[PDB]
């Protein structure tokens, strides 16, 4: 119907475009420092506009910058791109629009800048609405208590450190300890749990983010995940605004939702890959803007910064949509100094901690979680009733072992009861070891912990507990699918150990122990 195109055209051009001479506001750069321009005194600029720097001779691209400090006769604007090109006297025009990012269904399974520009080279983003960055928190009456669990897929977290929809759980650790491993496992575990994952990748390497994206691609995890990226080479402004763009996307998922696997999904998960490097980027931006340095040279408002970032993660009630947004910030502690500035800030503003230690990691134990100091302050509310009932015994026994952990090299030479406790603790700790990219579904973890808590693995030697778990799981998958289905179906039951599930599980485990030899 070309007549429709003819009617739509020929009217907007004649009397739909103002074409009115009016004077739009601009300024001129008067000093370019370390990625910071002053833009002279461009007036009528909102406190965080994005200035435009139109192309000039020797540059056919447009480079954007954030106007952060609005001084009298000076607007010190941090540049988002490369400052090699902007020169003194360059005319800069200010858009009236605050930073915005494309969001929604279309931006799914794509690697994008904080500004939303693709960096995957797979075409432009398809979208129709842009959500402004830097939004106010949901508020007081808008939220609901965290109840629905977020099955991360690794036994230690899902049993001892619950993560629920809306919770802000911190992965605090040191050097390489599996923080990205724990996060990437959590993301991979959401294949059919109605969640949209956001990875932010602040200050990482291009090769590292490429490797993570390849890992998600390999496990078919790019039909439900977004990846933002502001690598190390990128200017400090891009890293500074990266997590805010990521959580803007997450907020769009939370409020409106997206059509995932033929159903509307309003739950989101966002993993700020390094709030430590984010704070470092913000410190660079502040110090280059000559803002006053606070403790440890971080500006006075880094706490406010991470606070407004993280408090946008919430569990909206049914009135406002029922959506959710779980934040999983990650921090790179130095020498396990948890008392440093940003670690203290983030543990104070977050709802729980997942302490990853280098000692346990180098101790041969892959998942280096520290149950003693790690805490999820949501508690059992973020566990299914099944896992909640099963894991109390696990927590008690692990606590007992940690109390008597000094006797591993003296376990045999002790009381019978103490020897039994130490043996059980060693078996449980060996059981919590898990390889990488191998998430365990909730029913599987429930079955394994039901076995372990009850006196079933006592016959099993300690070094073979992991192999026992692996082949027992394979047995349940192939030999007794109905047991897994039954456990999954009544996971929410108030009294999970019902007679039917109890006897089915007992029969399955007894059959496996009879068939196998250890």
């Amino acid at each position: 119907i070309t007549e429709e195109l003819i009617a739509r055209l020929k009217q907007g051009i004649t009397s739909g475009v103002d074409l009115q001479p009016r004077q739009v506001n601009v300024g001129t750069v008067i000093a370019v420092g370390d990625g910071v321009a002053r833009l002279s005194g461009l007036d009528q600029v909102v406190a965080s506009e994005i200035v435009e720097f139109p192309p000039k001779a020797g540059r056919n691209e447009s480079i954007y910058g954030i106007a952060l400090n609005l001084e009298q006769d000076s607007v010190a604007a941090i540049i988002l791109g490369d400052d090699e090109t902007i020169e003194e006297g360059d005319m800069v025009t200010s858009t009236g629009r605050v930073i915005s990012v494309p969001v929604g269904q279309g931006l799914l399974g794509r690697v994008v800048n904080p500004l939303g520009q693709p960096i995957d080279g797979k075409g432009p983003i398809v979208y129709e609405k842009t959500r402004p960055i830097e939004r106010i928190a949901p508020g007081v009456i808008t939220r609901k208590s965290v109840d629905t669990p977020v099955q991360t897929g690794i036994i230690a977290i899902d049993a001892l450190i619950p993560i629920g929809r809306g919770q802000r759980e911190l992965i605090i650790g040191d050097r390489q300890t599996g923080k990205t491993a724990v996060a990437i496992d959590t993301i991979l575990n959401q294949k059919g749990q109605g969640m949209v994952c956001i990875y932010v990748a602040i200050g990482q390497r291009r090769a590292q983010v490429a490797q993570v994206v390849g890992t998600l691609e390999r496990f078919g995890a790019m039909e439900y995940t977004i990846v933002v990226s502001a690598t190390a080479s990128e200017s400090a402004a891009l890293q500074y605004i990266a997590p805010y763009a990521g959580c803007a996307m997450g907020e769009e998922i939370m409020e409106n939702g997206v059509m995932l696997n033929g159903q509307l999904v309003k739950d989101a998960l966002i993993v700020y890959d390094d709030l430590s490097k984010h704070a470092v980027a913000y410190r660079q931006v502040s110090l280059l803007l000559r803002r006053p340095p606070g403790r440890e040279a971080y500006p006075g408002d880094v706490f406010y910064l991470h606070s407004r970032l993280l408090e946008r993660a919430a569990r909206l009630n049914e009135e406002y949509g029922g959506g959710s947004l779980t934040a999983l910030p990650v921090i790179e502690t130095q020498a396990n100094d948890v008392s440093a500035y940003i670690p203290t800030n983030v543990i104070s503003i977050t709802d729980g901690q997942i302490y990853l230690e280098s000692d346990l990691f180098n101790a041969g134990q892959r998942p280096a979680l520290n149950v003693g100091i790690s805490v999820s302050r949501v508690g059992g509310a973020a566990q299914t009733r099944a896992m909640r009932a099963v894991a109390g015994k696990l927590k008690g026994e692990l606590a007992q072992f940690r109390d008597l952990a000094a006797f591993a090299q003296f376990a045999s030479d002790l009381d019978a009861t103490t020897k039994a406790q130490i043996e059980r603790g060693q078996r449980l700790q060996e059981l919590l070891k898990q390889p990488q990219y191998q998430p365990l579904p909730v029913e599987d973890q429930v079955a394994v912990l039901y076995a372990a808590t009850n006196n079933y693995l006592d016959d099993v030697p300690v070094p073979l507990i992991t192999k026992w778990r692996d082949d027992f799981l394979a047995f349940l998958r192939t030999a007794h699918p109905e047991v897994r289905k039954l456990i999954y179906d009544n996971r929410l039951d108030r009294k999970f150990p019902t007679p039917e599930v109890k006897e089915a599980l007992e029969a399955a485990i007894k059959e496996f122990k009879a068939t196998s030899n250890y």
């Binding site: 103002d18 074409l19 001479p21 797979k122 075409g123």
Partner: protein, 50 residues
């Protein structure tokens, strides 16, 4: 599937290249047409509202 996505992206990248070439050709031709056309009345457009 990866091969199929590559063909789609290759066509898309070819589409972008064609669009850029067409834009450059239009700019070169637009300059020629404008010069032969003349630009006497451009001043009148600068005061429709100012």
């Amino acid at each position: 599937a990866q091969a199929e996505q590559e063909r789609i992206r290759m066509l898309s990248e070819a589409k972008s290249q064609i669009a850029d070439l067409v834009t450059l050709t239009a700019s070169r031709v637009l300059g020629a047409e404008l010069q032969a056309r003349g630009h006497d009345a451009l001043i009148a457009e600068s005061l429709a509202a100012l």
